[PDB]
Ligand binder design. Sequence first.
Ligand SMILES: CCCCCCCCCCCCCCCCCC(=O)OC[C@H](COP(=O)([O-])OCC(O)COP(=O)([O-])OC[C@@H](COC(=O)CCCCCCCCCCCCCCCCC)OC(=O)CCCCCCCCCCCCCCCCC)OC(=O)CCCCCCCCCCCCCCCCC
Ligand SMILES: CCCCCCCCCCCCCCCCC[C@@H](O)O[C@H](CO[C@H](O)CCCCCCCCCCCCCCC)COP(=O)(O)OCC[N+](C)(C)C
Ligand SMILES: CCCCCCCCCCCCCCCCC[C@@H](O)O[C@H](CO[C@H](O)CCCCCCCCCCCCCCC)COP(=O)(O)OCC[N+](C)(C)C
Ligand SMILES: CCCCCCCCCCCCCCCCC[C@@H](O)O[C@H](CO[C@H](O)CCCCCCCCCCCCCCC)COP(=O)(O)OCC[N+](C)(C)C
Ligand SMILES: CCCCCCCC/C=C\CCCCCCCC(=O)O[C@H](COC(=O)CCCCCCC/C=C/CCCCCCCC)COP(=O)(O)OCCN
Ligand SMILES: Nc1ncnc2c1ncn2[C@@H]1O[C@H](COP(=O)(O)OP(=O)(O)O)[C@@H](O)[C@H]1O
Lengths: 320, 459, 107, 98, 54, 48, 121, 347
Amino acid sequence: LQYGPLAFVLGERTTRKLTETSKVITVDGNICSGKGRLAREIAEKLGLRHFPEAGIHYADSTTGDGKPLDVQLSGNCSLEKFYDDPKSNDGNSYRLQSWLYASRLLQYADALEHLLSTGQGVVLERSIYSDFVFLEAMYRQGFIRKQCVEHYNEVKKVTACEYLPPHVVVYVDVPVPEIQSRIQKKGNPHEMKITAAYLQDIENAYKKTFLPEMSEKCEVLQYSAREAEDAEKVVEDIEYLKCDKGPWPDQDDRTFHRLRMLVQNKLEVLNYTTIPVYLPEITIGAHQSDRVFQKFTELPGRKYSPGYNEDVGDKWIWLK
Amino acid sequence: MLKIIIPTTMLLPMTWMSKHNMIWINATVHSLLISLISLSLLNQLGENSLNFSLTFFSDSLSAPLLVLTTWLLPLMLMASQSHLSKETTTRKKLYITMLILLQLFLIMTFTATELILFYILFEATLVPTLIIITRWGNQTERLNAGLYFLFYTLAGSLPLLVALVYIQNTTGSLNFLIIHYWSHPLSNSWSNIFMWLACIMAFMVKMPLYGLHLWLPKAHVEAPIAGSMVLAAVLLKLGGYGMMRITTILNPLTNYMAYPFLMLSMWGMIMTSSICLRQTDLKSLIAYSSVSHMALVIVAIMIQTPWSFMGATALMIAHGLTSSMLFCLANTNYERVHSRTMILARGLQTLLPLMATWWLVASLTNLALPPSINLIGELFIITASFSWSNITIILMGMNMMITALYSLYMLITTQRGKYTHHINNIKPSFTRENALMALHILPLLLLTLNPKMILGPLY
Amino acid sequence: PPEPTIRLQEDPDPEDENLYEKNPDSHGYDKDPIVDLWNMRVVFFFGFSIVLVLGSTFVAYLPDYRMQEWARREAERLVKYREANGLPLMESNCFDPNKIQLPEDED
Amino acid sequence: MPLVYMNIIMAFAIALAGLLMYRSHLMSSLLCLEGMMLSLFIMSTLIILNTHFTLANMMPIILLVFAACEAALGLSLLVMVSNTYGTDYVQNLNLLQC
Amino acid sequence: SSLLDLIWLETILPKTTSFIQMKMSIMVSNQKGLIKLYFLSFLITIMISMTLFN
Amino acid sequence: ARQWQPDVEWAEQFGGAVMYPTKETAHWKPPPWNDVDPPKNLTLNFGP
Amino acid sequence: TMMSGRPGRVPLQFLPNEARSLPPPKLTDPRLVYMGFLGYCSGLIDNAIRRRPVVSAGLHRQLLYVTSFVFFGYYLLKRQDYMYALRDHDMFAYVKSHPEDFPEKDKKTYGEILEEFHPVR
Amino acid sequence: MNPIIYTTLIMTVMSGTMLVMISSHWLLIWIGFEMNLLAMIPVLMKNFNPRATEAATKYFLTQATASMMLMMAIIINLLYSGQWTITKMFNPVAMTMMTMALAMKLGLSPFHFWVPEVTQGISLQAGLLLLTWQKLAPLSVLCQISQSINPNLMLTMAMLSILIGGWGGLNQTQLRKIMAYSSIAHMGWMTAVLPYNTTMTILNLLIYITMTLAMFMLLIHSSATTTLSLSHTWNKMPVITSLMMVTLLSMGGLPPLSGFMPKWMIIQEMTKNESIIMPTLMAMTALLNLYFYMRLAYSSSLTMFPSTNNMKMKWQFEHTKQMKLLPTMIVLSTLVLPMTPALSSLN
Ligand SMILES: CCCCCCCCCCCCCCCCCC(=O)OC[C@H](COP(=O)([O-])OCC(O)COP(=O)([O-])OC[C@@H](COC(=O)CCCCCCCCCCCCCCCCC)OC(=O)CCCCCCCCCCCCCCCCC)OC(=O)CCCCCCCCCCCCCCCCC
Ligand SMILES: CCCCCCCCCCCCCCCCC[C@@H](O)O[C@H](CO[C@H](O)CCCCCCCCCCCCCCC)COP(=O)(O)OCC[N+](C)(C)C
Ligand SMILES: CCCCCCCCCCCCCCCCC[C@@H](O)O[C@H](CO[C@H](O)CCCCCCCCCCCCCCC)COP(=O)(O)OCC[N+](C)(C)C
Ligand SMILES: CCCCCCCCCCCCCCCCC[C@@H](O)O[C@H](CO[C@H](O)CCCCCCCCCCCCCCC)COP(=O)(O)OCC[N+](C)(C)C
Ligand SMILES: CCCCCCCC/C=C\CCCCCCCC(=O)O[C@H](COC(=O)CCCCCCC/C=C/CCCCCCCC)COP(=O)(O)OCCN
Ligand SMILES: Nc1ncnc2c1ncn2[C@@H]1O[C@H](COP(=O)(O)OP(=O)(O)O)[C@@H](O)[C@H]1O
């Protein structure tokens, strides 16, 4: 019995599962900062489920086989080309940004669904909030246009107006020269082409806008590079504070039921990511769309519903 | 009559269950078999009819149209095989389903012993052809063509429905046998005049009548090849058929209510034949030629003499075959040039001699060359009109002159002269296209040997 | 003007594929030689051989259900009977007037 | 039909016209609706009492109660509208249009 | 070709009908959404129904 | 060599608030994708 | 017609008792077959909507569709036949009870009926 | 809201409609209308936003005015005859007042102004309920009092409704406004046959309810409320768009679909009563509804509109919630013409 109105009517309530350890945490930081390791350690210590940062093929790991699909079928964008040619004529920058925001929204929906259905809290990397810092970085660098940022703002408003912001936001502060040296020591050739202005602009967007606006509605733990390795202290401040300024205390069983309806059924989560506003970077012609959709249908376990694909080995088709 | 209805219905399951690469073969073979079965309807009797049951009945007017309808489908599949090559299996099956549904409605329309069933199927045919025009059409003007074709028809046809229900409420039945046997004269009154107009407009709109023909060049130019064939050959004749059914209850009003339409058709055939002389498009020229021939058919039906009816039946059959062949030839040129402009691809007799002789024969049948059945219909209608009034011969002779002129102009511009230098993708004519042309043209010259098969119930 | 002059993401218009270059003697029915050859064979056999010839022969030898020769023989015997007995061939009245009751005028 | 019935019917008509005028102040729309109800109650009571239709004496009360319920409903709606705009002005209700 | 078929025969039946229907649609559908006008028209039609028909 | 399909310019006809825009209704603006419009504690001084 | 107020009509009976005096429709009725075909079409539409093999996804579901459609169609046909029989019965009774409003026309033969002739010229 | 309270409110709406349908006392019918409105108001505001509140307050104003005029007509009828039973009315003025009140409740022109706005304000599910279930009680009352209705007024508002729906549907890109105008036109068609035959009214009501249910459930499945948002559906699930095109063709009255059955029969019935001009005008007017249905079909399924890149991710997910009876609704709205003579069941 999939959770619905009937389950809520009979027994299903999500306020009996919350044990003060939900406390969804997101860790934010500039490129190549050790936020991933710190988030993994926090999830390990607090008993929370860690969510690796959303990539191009995050959705490909949650449907069908966990294996990623072709770039032509999933994303139609590449980060390496964005690093190589951020000002290209095919609009890869804003297409990548929009796909990444959609993947981040889907990941947030999955995390919220897990938190509401099981009661166990979760830890995330950069969420839908703080995804805008990259958008601003591309805009000031001239990579993308103003119409792209307006469309991003419309989509972000319409989508994020329906989800609860995280309790705890953790920011790792690493100065631009330090992360530049980290990139140079990483060995990734495409990452070496990141200009110092881009990283400075990401940090500027973090400090000037994201952090103050999150601080007014939740609690922030701004940490420098040296204070990030001792995760015991980070867990200590996480546990010490109590969230009395966010909307999470105001939620109850009715709002929880509505939110649990929203988080599952991902087609409504992603409904407004495809609004009919025609930006040349993201709009696709009819012929290309037709042939790409036809190619996607030809995939082994993608022609029918998951339980009705004979070629991947489904049996008892005629009685399901 | 169900021995033809059920196999046609049967084609749909066969197409859907067929292999991704075997749909065309199965459809063509079984449609040809159904066409062969339909030939048993040609054995008509000089008495009333072949009354199969309470629902369906066949006559010597319905039988040739039914045979033509069943014969068309394999040719339409052959012509559609080419430009649907890059098309998905589901959508190809949908196109074949549209053709099968159209043929089923057309078959059930001609038998249609009762007038309301005839109207229901007569307007049911409107949906598959609209879908064919507006879905599998190349240009952006296919939407406007579909809208014009839909709305002209429906505006002309709804008063027919009102008139039919009124007639059934007054007489008690709409069965054609009872209508013919219990027929009574129509008094000279305003109400009777408007009943006449309501009964007549629906069929005058789809001939089409001159002035009410603006939908036809649009719908025929912008439709795919199979759509153009089915529009020109069979869908235009429906109204003609309908008139020879309904004018049995419109006497003696037709004695003077026909003057506006007689003048309209007599002047409109001349006007459209002259329009054909200055045309920059092949398909538009063929469509306007169809308009002229159907104007002649309108005159024949309105004269209301036995020779008029025989000529009208022969002319509908001959025009259907000839116009289908002409559209097929134009599409063969178009699939190579992709332009549909008459003046661009020239001197094609040098490169495609067999296509050139196919063009010559199609044009000659368009000229109404004796002893072809086109000439038989033309001559019967002309003789009946001369009996009606001796002055009509001027208009008919002028129409014959202009018809020969524009037909030979179409032949000379496209086939003769010097080839265009920069067009280098004129591939040899395929066996499929030659077979299509042969299967268009051989029935005409075989029908010229047995004219009584297509001369109608008044023979 | 930083616009790329590209209105959207679209595939290029593909070029016409010649059925002769990959397979000569191609018959124009299909791009698979076996299916194409069988399509040609079935079309030619069922159209030209079965429908066109056998159907034409069936139509040629259809029994006289229209009764042309029957009417000829009936006319022959009527003419013989009326010439032998001096009757005036065809009569100008279709129905004998002894059973038509015209309305008395009394005008 | 004496003059009292005419006067009450005329009062109902006046209240209906005032409701349909809609100058402003949706509260006035509710007030006109409830004046219409009051006229209905008054003349229905007169008709029932005049004819001595005993079992029908319950009908006015019932009507009253139901109408009052509607008023509560309407009042609630009014408050909601104010909570979006600060005033109950009729012209603020123009987001949806034909 | 042009004077009657492309211009006047189009202007008479299809174009005139399209123009008239478009104008009437614009007239009908152009309502500001203000209920003042709606209920004023409601009062008008109520009075008209009471008076004219009977 | 390809069947025509609608492009962005063709689609922009159906994106307006109404069909057949007029001078008066030019002003009218299309509704939000999600049907919600933006919304766009008192102090008392108890003196002596 | 408006037989709603017909005397002796049970307020909410689908099939009255007198309807049992009429022959039931045969199980091979063309209309019953059409209802079965409608049920099969509904099953195919259901298979298509849920993204399942349209022809052969659920045989039990399609069988239930066809069976329910046939059941309801059989009862609907029974009710329709009964209603038409009632209409004919009332018609004939009214004609019998009012001979002054349905007099017998004196049979006249076409040899003594004057019909105007309109030549076609 | 709470699912238990939502079920209670829906059951209360249905109980008000049934109380209207099963009662013979005018006071009980008025009580049923009152209960129906009271329970319906919250459903329109199930999702809270300013537009939903605006739609609810407009709906409440119109319905309360209609109910008050209904009670006025009832009390006048009692005054001129001490009768409470719902039958032919005994006063002409009360009859016109009752006719106008029921037309306001149904949305017949010139009382049509609230329908497009209320439909646009509320969600798709609330719009489905409002356009399908809320037409039963007033039509039942009209069927009960059909013998006393003045044909002139009733037919005037019927023809006005048909013309207004046809004209107003041509100017709409929003799907809910199109649905509202289509409902106005179909109520106009329903009303024009009440003086002559109520069985035809019920047949048209059932066919229209089936067609509207199919339309609204297809619109809920493909969560689109505009023309352009619906134009994206072909790139995800073309079967929905094909079924939607067939349903739109049926809604336009095209034979041999189901939507041809009502108009046909209606015309037939009107012809029995020596009425020729009005059915002709109604048919040529319904051509306009067919036109904007065809425009929707052109922009939805007969052409492929440009898509977006994010659409690709939606290719990886299915519909978790399924609407049962959708295939049945589609089939009953498209392929029931050959069973037309079943209307003798007095549906
Ligand atoms: C006079 C009456 C007589 C004739 C009756 C006519 C109606 C009858 C049938 C009515 C509907 C019921 C079945 C339809 C189910 C829909 C499923 C479908 O889409 O087809 C896929 C499916 C095959 O594909 P698949 O591999 O399973 O999966 C692909 C996905 O399903 C989907 O593939 P995909 O998504 O990858 O492809 C996309 C495609 C897929 O989207 C669709 O194709 C949707 C289908 C159209 C909607 C159906 C309309 C609903 C009913 C209204 C009918 C209107 C008729 C009135 C005349 C007006 C004409 C419009 O969408 C498009 O391409 C959109 C662009 C095209 C423009 C719009 C085309 C116009 C649509 C109007 C169609 C009307 C006729 C339907 C004929 C049947 C079509 C399957 O087709 C079938 O297999 C079902 C066909 C019937 C099964 C027959 C089996 C029996 C044979 C053996 C037993 C022999 C019986 C005799 C006994 C004797 C034995 C001894
Ligand atoms: C545009 C492309 C073609 C579209 C279709 C064109 C075909 C439609 C034309 C309709 C055919 C004729 C209609 C009415 C003809 C009646 C005979 C009339 O012309 O003659 C005189 C009629 O007198 C006058 O004409 C009175 C009518 C004047 C007003 C009618 C308008 C005529 C022109 C309208 C043409 C508009 C066509 C498009 C309409 C949408 C005889 O006078 P009288 O012997 O005493 O009365 C005989 C009739 N009775 C016995 C029934 C009484
Ligand atoms: C390449 C160079 C040439 C090589 C070939 C050389 C040979 C040439 C000979 C052929 C042409 C010369 C003319 C010879 C004609 C002889 C045959 C003809 O006389 O028979 C006709 C018979 O022909 C048929 O009647 C007509 C053919 C049927 C046409 C139907 C077409 C087949 C169906 C195709 C689909 C239909 C689509 C169109 C819908 C209507 C008429 O005969 P008839 O004296 O009277 O009665 C027959 C005998 N009876 C007395 C015993 C009864
Ligand atoms: C698409 C067509 C509409 C939908 C078809 C119905 C689908 C759901 C129906 C499922 C079962 C419902 C049947 C009701 C069961 C018992 C019925 C009984 O209790 O009540 C009877 C009522 O039964 C109905 O009359 C018959 C219902 C059958 C409706 C189908 C006919 C629709 C027209 C034909 C279109 C194609 C139908 C076939 C395809 C399915 C007695 O009526 P009565 O209380 O004394 O008088 C009230 C009516 N008056 C006032 C007008 C006189
Ligand atoms: C391609 C577009 C063409 C559009 C179609 C136009 C056809 C015009 C024909 C008139 C339509 C309605 C005719 C009614 C159907 C016949 C029923 C009938 O004859 O009954 C008449 C009904 O006659 C009428 O009502 C006719 C009124 C016409 C109303 C609509 C007018 C439309 C325009 C009229 C002028 C143009 C007509 C020809 C136009 C040709 C197309 C361009 C009287 O019956 P009773 O009253 O019961 O018996 C008499 C004693 N009481
Ligand atoms: N919203 C975004 N836009 C563009 N690139 C992004 C975005 N989010 C993450 N990335 C890229 O993802 C890459 C890996 O993310 P990051 O966490 O910074 O490094 P690491 O995984 O080694 O810890 C980086 O190159 C970063 O630029």
